[PDB]
Design a protein around this ligand. Sequence first.
Ligand SMILES: [Mg+2]
Length: 684
Amino acid sequence: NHLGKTEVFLNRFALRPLNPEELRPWRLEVVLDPPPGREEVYPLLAQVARRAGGVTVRMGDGLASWSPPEVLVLEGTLARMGQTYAYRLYPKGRRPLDPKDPGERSVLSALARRLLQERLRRLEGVWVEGLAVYRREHARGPGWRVLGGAVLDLWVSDSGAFLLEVDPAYRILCEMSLEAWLAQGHPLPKRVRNAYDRRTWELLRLGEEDPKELPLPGGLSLLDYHASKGRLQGREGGRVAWVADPKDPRKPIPHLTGLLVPVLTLEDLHEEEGSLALSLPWEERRRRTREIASWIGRRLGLGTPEAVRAQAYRLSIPKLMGRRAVSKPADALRVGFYRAQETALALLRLDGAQGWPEFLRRALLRAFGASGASLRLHTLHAHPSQGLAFREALRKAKEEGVQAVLVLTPPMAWEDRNRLKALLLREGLPSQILNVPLREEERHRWENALLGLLAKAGLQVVALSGAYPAELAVGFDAGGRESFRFGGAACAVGGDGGHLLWTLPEAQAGERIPQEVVWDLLEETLWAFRRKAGRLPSRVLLLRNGRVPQDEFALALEALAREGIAYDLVSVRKSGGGRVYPVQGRLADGLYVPLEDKTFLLLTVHRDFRGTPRPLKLVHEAGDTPLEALAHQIFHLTRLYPASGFAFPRLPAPLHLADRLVKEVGRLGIRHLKEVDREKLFFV
DNA sequence: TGAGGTAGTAGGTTGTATAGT
RNA sequence: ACAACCUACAUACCUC
Ligand SMILES: [Mg+2]
């Protein structure tokens, strides 16, 4: 291997191999009357394990248990969606289970997790929410405290051992009333909770009215209302607080500051305690992970936790190219772009002012200068508020070669931001917004806006230098909406990624992308590749955001086989990688950690040293390229994103683009894009 | 709307198996 | 519940 080896710890710990009594659980038969449904079988079975108590988990059509029947509720009744059933338990003996059997250890692990939860529940000082355990005050001030602990997990190996996973976690508690909060000179909190339950509101403002006068819609006093429900006992109804249901922060609602509790944010506490942060440097996290594991191991009698370690590899650093070698995409602004054509940009200024700020103009002129390309700056002399007549000014501008517009504006409300983007999109004019209290020293902001204005005009700002197996990299993502999704793709064409493009996403019902929409989108990207290279890709790299639904690529993969195109399919999850810590030395991004076959972690970005990185977990779902070669290419593709300028995304450019793309479309809609080139990244 | 990221609180989702015959 | 993920706070906070 030409890559440097390193050892790492995962945040997992190996514990004892299971004993006899743990492998052979009390089995049981479940007789539900009225007999269950079909979509309601498992859900009711599980609600029976919780209703039976003890270390019980469902197994097939019944349940397994690490508890004696003599402490199990064998006769009872639970009410599901409409129907009221009655259960009865029949001890079907005590059969042994098999750690190798995938779906059997699913039960063993299930029980392990249940064991862990009950042992924790009986501990005195600790607070336990699900699998998170908080055990120690970590910080505190007047009225608030932060508890420290860790979310945990206990599962069973294929090889019959217990596995403990630990990751440090914090909980912020505020226990003072809003009245007291404000009386001690603190600022208004954006959100606020009921003192008598969990209902939490957004806090609009304080009221000048009197509680005992504030007439409650249909009845009595603001105060008398609350008094009625006995909420003033051992409390003081304070002043009037106007709040709003966060789902529709319009209609204001009367409340008492004596009965609201602030919900605090890390910054409301960094104001008090100061220098208090909830993210950890990786070495502090590693230390605390080890401490916590040892703490629990000692309350658990499953052996001494032995931190599991893996072999990691430092991947080669990507050589990023502008017109000349660059180290981040913003440097292309100084050196020149990878490939700049003739381009024309327009300005729409929506403060009271007029004309291109000279420093932006010069920055642009310099950038095109270094690149040896022509630039023609235009200025829209029309206002969005001129209604339909505005459109004639936009059409005029596109009919003069304008490829994108810079919008100089005061901060716009989200509604108006979308309204405007859309409005310019109708005329095939992608837009970059730049907020207008703006000063030349605010450099990272306007230089990023510039990088975006250029991607939106179709310029390729950077490309890779290197040899990769795949000449086409395409990433697939689903949806930028709640009750339905989108599903689209973005594209790194050429082995250098010399071109980036997107494809119009297609509305769908859930996560799963219709088998044929997958192949459709893929075909779009192959035709893109063909008219750039005059030929078909010899090999493609296929990437999905998140899990890959069962054979949703099956149809697309056979079509590729038909056409004689080679391929790999990788699933890229943002969660589920846990943590990775060097045993010795620094940790730099570019970290590759093989796990099982067809799977590995990739530490793609490390940069904000006050926080701990979260590795991507990747699964090799189809194809037979060496894991390490996939890792190498994914990693480098990380560096290809044009619109970030000063920091690389954690995701490979195509998956990061696909994400951004389905989010934009879910926000703006699918209309107004017929006249927007697919090389113009309108959505960055 | 500058954009990369790690951390929280409060309130959400889809994908999975699940019979009958 | 397991698994993968969304939104609000948040143009927040940290970072360049
Ligand atoms: Mg943007």
